[PDB]
Design a protein around this ligand. Structure first.
Ligand code: HEM
Length: 407
């Protein structure tokens, strides 16, 4: 076939569902870089994608992504019992009490950043989110963060995912940021192991520093560093969803009123933000053995891409996926395959994001503050979603003016 890399890069979120619409199917054979790729979309496709007897991640991860977005040696590259034992380390972090502690730290950091925002008079809301998230998640994770370094660390953490998917010299910064952040986290792990850093027994950094693998060995300091960044970086990336929260409040009538007066609405709202808005485009795996599925060949070694955005906008699952309607979540059956903004399947037995509880609790804090606490004006701007950007954002970055707080 022809190489469709540039077409994908031009339309990362929609490329797959669009061709699926053109072809009248939930899957199509394509080619990105050198490799023939099966592209899949929808609930049934996701379910076979998460079948670990048919798919592996080891031979999947494009090694320019490990130099920016993910690091080398982390949980995303693992399969089988090695993966499950590493994944359990992340899952133990996510108790309701610890998730709530992080949400509270973030609300306090949001409230502390507001006087700064007022004094600026006008802010790019997205730009302003990285630092309070960095301060909160570092504190929560037992990562010391001096006051005068937070701004810089936040910038480096942001560069890992926002300068990563960037067809620009911004890629060089992303790579330097990765080496800097990995070296920084490694010094954190080393200090914890030597006893010069007193991170608490319940914190991410402690758990990761002291984790023993299936051979009863500590992770090498660099692998532990990568796994710690796998907590810090994606927590900072919640800036994107918080920006989408403000965007929904501004562009969809009735949403604000419902949030203020209906206590159960907020949970429905944050879920619909995750379903509706583009964030993580697609996940990649490799077929581990020859099989056939719905007339399509999956030879051993075939790269397979599961389209998350398309699956989240699948009309067989949702009725009117194109509409933004939190109420749709009253009727959701909690299926692990038909709603997949951060992966599908089981958290313990597959690669599904262990960050979902944190994302939900932090988006709830955001929605609460933006309706019950924050006061702000929204000038004329281009709020349209930039579907060509990774991550996608309102083109303006959501601009606020005259910002102040209450309690
Ligand atoms: C900010 C919004 C987030 C989005 C859009 C997102 C999305 C995703 C997606 C699509 C995957 C891959 C699932 C797969 O490979 O099948 C993933 C995995 C992962 N996420 Fe997130 N996530 C977010 C937040 C978080 C947070 C807050 C954490 C903090 C702990 C986190 C930690 C991880 C880790 C460690 C993995 C790898 C898990 C594995 O391979 O088993 N993520 N996420």
């Amino acid at each position: 076939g022809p190489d469709e890399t540039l077409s994908l890069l031009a339309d990362p979120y929609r490329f797959i569902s669009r061709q699926c619409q053109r072809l009248g199917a939930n899957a199509f054979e394509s080619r990105f870089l050198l490799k023939k790729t099966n592209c899949l979309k929808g609930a049934k496709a996701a379910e076979i994608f998460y079948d670990t007897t048919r798919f592996e991640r080891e031979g999947a991860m494009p090694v320019a992504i490990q130099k920016t977005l993910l690091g080398q040696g982390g949980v995303q590259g693992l399969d089988g019992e090695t993966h499950r034992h590493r994944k359990q380390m992340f899952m133990g972090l996510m108790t309701p009490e610890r998730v709530r502690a992080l949400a509270q730290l973030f609300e306090a950091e949001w409230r502390r950043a507001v006087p700064g925002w007022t004094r600026k008079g006008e802010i790019v809301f997205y730009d302003e989110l990285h630092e309070p998230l960095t301060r909160a998640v570092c504190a929560w994770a037992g990562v010391p963060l001096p006051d005068d370094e937070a701004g810089n660390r936040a910038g480096e953490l942001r560069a890992l995912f926002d300068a990563a998917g960037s067809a620009s010299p911004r890629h060089l910064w992303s790579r330097l940021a990765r080496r800097r952040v990995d070296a920084w986290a490694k010094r954190i792990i080393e200090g914890i192991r030597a006893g010069s850093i007193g991170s608490g027994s319940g914190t991410a950094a402690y758990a990761i520093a002291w984790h023993r693998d299936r051979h009863d060995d500590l992770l090498s300091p660099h692998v532990a560093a990568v796994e710690l960044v796998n907590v810090l970086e994606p927590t900072v990336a919640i800036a994107v969803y918080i920006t989408f929260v403000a965007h929904a409040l501004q562009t969809c009538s009735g949403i604000r009123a419902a949030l203020v007066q209906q206590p159960d609405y907020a949970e429905l709202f944050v879920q619909e933000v995750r379903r509706f808005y583009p964030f993580f485009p697609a996940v990649v795996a490799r077929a581990s053995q020859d099989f056939e599925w719905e007339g399509m060949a999956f030879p051993e070694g075939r790269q397979v891409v599961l389209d998350l955005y398309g699956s989240n906008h699948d009309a067989a699952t949702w009725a009117d996926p194109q509409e933004f309607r939190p109420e749709r979540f009253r009727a959701w059956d909690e299926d692990s395959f038909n709603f997949i903004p951060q992966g599908g399947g089981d958290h313990y037995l597959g690669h599904r994001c262990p960050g979902e509880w944190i994302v939900l609790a932090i988006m709830k804090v955001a929605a609460h503050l933006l309706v019950n606490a924050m006061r702000y004006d929204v000038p004329d701007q281009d709020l349209s979603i930039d579907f060509a950007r990774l991550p996608a954002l309102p083109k303006s970055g959501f601009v606020m003016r005259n910002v102040h707080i209450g309690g």
